[PDB]
Amino acid sequence: VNSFSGYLKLTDNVYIKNADIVEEAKKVKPTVVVNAANVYLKHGGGVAGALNKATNNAMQVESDDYIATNGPLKVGGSCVLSGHNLAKHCLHVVGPNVNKGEDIQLLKSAYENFNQHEVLLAPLLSAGIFGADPIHSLRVCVDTVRTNVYLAVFDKNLYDKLVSSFL
Known part of the structure; x- marks a missing residue:
């Protein structure tokens, strides 16, 4: 059992919630929060x-x-x-920035970093201001991360689209 609350379960190991990543971290104080770093x-x-x-x-x-x-x-x-x-820790992960022309195939490599940590609070890599399709980012996450990941999605509209379209 862990402290994460209100998440929808997508798979055995991936969970998702509409939430402000800075408010979720402040409430839970997870072992690992992931930053969308450059x-x-x-x-x-x-x-x-x-x-x-x-x-x-x-x-x-x-x-x-x-x-x-x-x-x-x-x-x-x-x-x-x-x-x-x-x-406790911040895992700074660099997804490819489409608005700089970086190889989207590097998104899988970015998500592989999560596997070094048993549980994480994270954003969708390469989404938001990084320029990738968040639906794609969620698919790579589910197909790459084997540890337990709690995804915080900032936009309510995008959250609902990610859930509704999830295969």
């Missing part, structure tokens, strides 16, 4: 900007030190950093 860990807008704002910019300060030491992530890659006030 390779520079520059959290200016979208999921990253909202999560970072909720940490009072401490996520960005920690991320700048990580990049100064290690250099940029790979598209499809990840790193584990603090979850600050939101979670």
Whole structure:
């Protein structure tokens, strides 16, 4: 049993809910929250900007030190950093950004990072301001992630379309 509430079950391991990812993390304090990161860990807008704002910019300060030491992530890659006030850990995952021309086949590689964690609270990778089709992102998630993933979908309209169209 875990603390996640109000989710619709899609598969053995994937759950979905219409919710503000920063409000869900604050309520649950999950072991892992996933950030929709870029390779520079520059959290200016979208999921990253909202999560970072909720940490009072401490996520960005920690991320700048990580990049100064290690250099940029790979598209499809990840790193584990603090979850600050939101979670124990934040898994920063880089899905391909269609609005930069990145290979959508890298979305499966991005979701494979989730398999290193038994339970996660996450957004749909490469959705929102990243430019991919969220229906596609949900299919890759279900076909790639084997650990238990609780997906938070920001838009009520999109949530209802993801559920209604789910095979």
